[PDB]
Amino acid sequence: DRGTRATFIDFSVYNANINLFCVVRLLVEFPATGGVIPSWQFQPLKLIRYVTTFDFFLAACEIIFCFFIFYYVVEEILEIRIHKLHYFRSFWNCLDVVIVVLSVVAIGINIYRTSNVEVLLQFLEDQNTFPNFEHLAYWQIQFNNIAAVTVFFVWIKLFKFINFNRTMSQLSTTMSRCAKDLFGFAIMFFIIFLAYAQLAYLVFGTQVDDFSTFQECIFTQFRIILGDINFAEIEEANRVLGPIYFTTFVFFMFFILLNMFLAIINDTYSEVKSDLAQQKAEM
Amino acid sequence: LVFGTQVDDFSTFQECIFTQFRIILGDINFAEIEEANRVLGPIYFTTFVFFMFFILLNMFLAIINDTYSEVKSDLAQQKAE
Amino acid sequence: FMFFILLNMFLAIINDTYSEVKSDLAQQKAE
Amino acid sequence: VTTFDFFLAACEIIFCFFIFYYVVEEILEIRIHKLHYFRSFWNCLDVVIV
Amino acid sequence: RFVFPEPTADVNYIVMLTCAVCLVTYMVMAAILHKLDQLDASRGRRFKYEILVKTGWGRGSGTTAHVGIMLYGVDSRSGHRHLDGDRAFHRNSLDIFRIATPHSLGSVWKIRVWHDNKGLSPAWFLQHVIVRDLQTARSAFFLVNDWLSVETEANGGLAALLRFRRLLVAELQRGFFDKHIWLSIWDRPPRSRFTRIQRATCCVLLICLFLGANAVWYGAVGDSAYSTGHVSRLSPLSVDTVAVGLVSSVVVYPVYLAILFLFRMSRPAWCASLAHGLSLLLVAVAVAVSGWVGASFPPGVSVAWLLSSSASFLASFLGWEPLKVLLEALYFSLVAKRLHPFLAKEEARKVKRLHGMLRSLLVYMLFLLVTLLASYGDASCHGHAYRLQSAIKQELHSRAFLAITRSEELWPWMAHVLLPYVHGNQSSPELGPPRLRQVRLQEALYPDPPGPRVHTCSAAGGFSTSDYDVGWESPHNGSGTWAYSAPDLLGAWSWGSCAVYDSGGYVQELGLSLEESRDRLRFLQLHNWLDNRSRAVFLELTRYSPAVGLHAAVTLRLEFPAAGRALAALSVRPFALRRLSAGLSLPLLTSVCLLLFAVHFAVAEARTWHREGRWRVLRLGAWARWLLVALTAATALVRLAQLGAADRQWTRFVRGRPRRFTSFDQVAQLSSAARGLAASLLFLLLVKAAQQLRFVRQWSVFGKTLCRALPELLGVTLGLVVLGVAYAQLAWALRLWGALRLGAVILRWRYHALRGELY
């Protein structure tokens, strides 16, 4: 009727060749102002893991991973308590806590979800009723979103281990020393970035649909920085404040603001190399 | 890990590398990155542009800018020596 | 090799030309 | 009739404001500052341009 | 007599923005007070002429004594050091009183002193401070100047049995701006232990508690007086909002008195460091509960809550704190009746600058809050506006309309897609019949040579204004059947392609129901209503969505650059019809608050204009101030004009709804402009927030290296523009030139020079 606001369609499939369930959800939304908005979600779950030897291999690697994270958390508690307190001015220890927290969250989610499979058993009792696999897909998505960030930080941590000669050491020194002062300009640049974002959201955020939301405005500005979006629709959106905004943004934040980042890095590297070269006139 | 199932541009592993290289040339689509994962996708896109076009691509130029000046100074001094 | 190692030598050349012009002008006007 | 000639009109208005700024600035260089001193070839252009 | 509503999820941004502003201002003010307190901590151990008490009245005084001196008088009070002399207070050991006492009022009773020694002493009594008029002349060099003893009665002007009046007046004069918490973050007496910073914690605690209590009472207590709701008009009755503000302040006051008592007299060994923690909890909790109770405010009580909070703050500042200091003075006077309540002189200008910055920060934060409200008060019916306009554009088949060139398919288009859209079973309630105002020109056009268009449209002339008949011109008996329908002065300027149009022309009502409207459409089609010159067509009717509460002005335009060809353009502008007579809606309050700020800036500008005199021109600051004032005034006036025009149009409509049009379009224009201007104004403020980042020693260079290289950047831009005009005078480019990264080298050089010159 005219009163409806949302419609869902749900089902799932097995594809017995490989061992991967696939749950399918289709949403259709009816805004009160008229129109239709579709959305879809296909999720490849896996619930019957232990069949082949590779599955036991993966389980063993999971156990070893739990042992490793337990080892790291123990050696971190030992270091925080039985050694220097408030050792947070390093950025190399504030990274370990993030990694261990993300890992323990992932393990907790896995224990919560994997141990919760009785719905499959209920479906296997009688197979003429709708299976309820929606929660499992959501938790699988959440687990993937955590593992994908955990692996990123684990890879990032490797930078601590590359100082095996003069060149890498000096590059690391330049990169670290150039972070204390780039922080201020980053803040001052993001303030103007958000000022442009809110201005665009308030002005064009009603007829363009690229500026229809604040984060969408931020993404549009980043795309313009990459050089992807053209203002061929902004004039239709607005003829007074359109070209003015576009020109001001592409001039002030692409010819002036974006070069201080180059200048600071260039000067820091130059002074660092000069200092390290002068470190040989004394020896 | 995030987009390796539904975009089709990050299906394999080397495909991700080639897609990032195309992004460096400014050939992003972003019509599927944002709808494949509304959170953690735009985060990746935004943090990828800020750490490449602003920081990590201004370091090659710094080295090439400093070394050129240094070598010209040394060579000119040697010529005038 | 086209965007990272070969494009930036052009910018380095421009930068060095500007710096040399600046230094020469400063030396001449401060002599 | 266009969306570019209006920018030209705005530039003309800005130009008129600049000429007002330079004419309100030159009278003080003759009244308060010592007058009848144009043998500089620089105060000469400033007035003829205006 | 309580309720846990949790009705909806649509957050109310007003409370969130207010809380965010109140915490940000506290953070920055605490940051400033950190240095303002470190200076006092370092200084832990003219006002008048050089005080001199160098005398030799006594001998054999090899002991020590303390001679305290108090410079009484309004707005000036400070103690003095001990009775240390040139020979350790021994025989004839008295020096000039060259102690730093910058507190000294005018020709008032600035005289008070006392002495405390190890019991008694010989006849060593320094006469007085012989300072008549050398620097400021706060008093004369004449007093009793004779033998004295401990607790000297150093009274004066420019047993004491009446201890009552003297004790009360002294205690009030000392504590009228110290105990008073609000304006004490500026006048803390030195050597005290109340730390100059937790004074800000008390203030932020009061603000957050006021906000929380008011947010609870509004929308959490509607049983005892059920006076709230639909029967409660948001307009301030001046009998109710003040009452709830007062009662909220009174009920929340005791916990403040408890936390202050835990602060004062704490060094109780170290409990003060606990108290901060408590505050950092309570305010948060307060904010939290606001963020839970304010999410379900009806759209009219939000202004009432702000008024109640303002009244509550103004109540605890206009008598409650004075009452507390008065009762404290009486308690002290009636309990224990205590009788005593270029090297290193550059810091004075530093303290003055810090006080000025602290005073300007509050005004900046208040202006930021009011402009944030003016901008995002209704930042919830904003995505709905986009969805509504997109839906309207979609169901009108905008693509099918923007791809018509001949002036013949317009009739099938209207008969097929538009008329079924206007009428139907329910079919998108309209609120207004359509119109077909139309212009003729009278300057008959001729088709261009083969080809769509050579450069542009041309051959314009004088728009026709005469009367005509069925078919065209034939006025025989009386008034023409197709009158001109003279344009209104409000609502015009569509700004098409060929020229700038207006609201004048020959109109058609287009009937009421589908059958009659279609028949009349065909009737006027066959009788040659639209085949002649007929520059424009101007189809535009209405739209209104009750579900969200937004109207939409829809305008369709076909234009004729030449006889035979057309150009299509449509505009759907959504807005919210908020009348001026609706009470004290938030936009009206923000508009009347912005005018006060504009007046304040104008007054502050004129007070310096006339102080320095004329010829203050040629300074960028004056121009910036006079442009900011103009922008603020324009924003306020445009918003007020939109509010007035909405009411005018709505009254005109409700007058003759059945067969009128009333053209709400102008309102949709103003609501746009009043939303653009503010959007720019806030922008400026944000930019300012970047510049004031320079108050960091490390980050002060990022502004200097950009203000120093401005001439070079302008020169480079000049080169760009001259090469660009040359590129066209011989008859890409910008891309290759901008790929040079030219500004980078100038910025790098300036940065290197500034860093080198920083050490």
Ligand SMILES: C[C@@H](CO)CCC[C@@H](C)[C@H]1CC[C@H]2[C@@H]3[C@@H](O)C=C4C[C@@H](O)CC[C@]4(C)[C@H]3CC[C@]12C
């Ligand atoms: C006083 C000093 C500090 O100690 C500041 C230095 C300012 C200076 C570098 C700036 C000021 C005006 C600029 C020129 C412009 O006016 C038109 C042009 C024409 C174009 O074909 C090439 C470029 C050129 C020459 C510009 C060159 C750079 C200039 C000379």
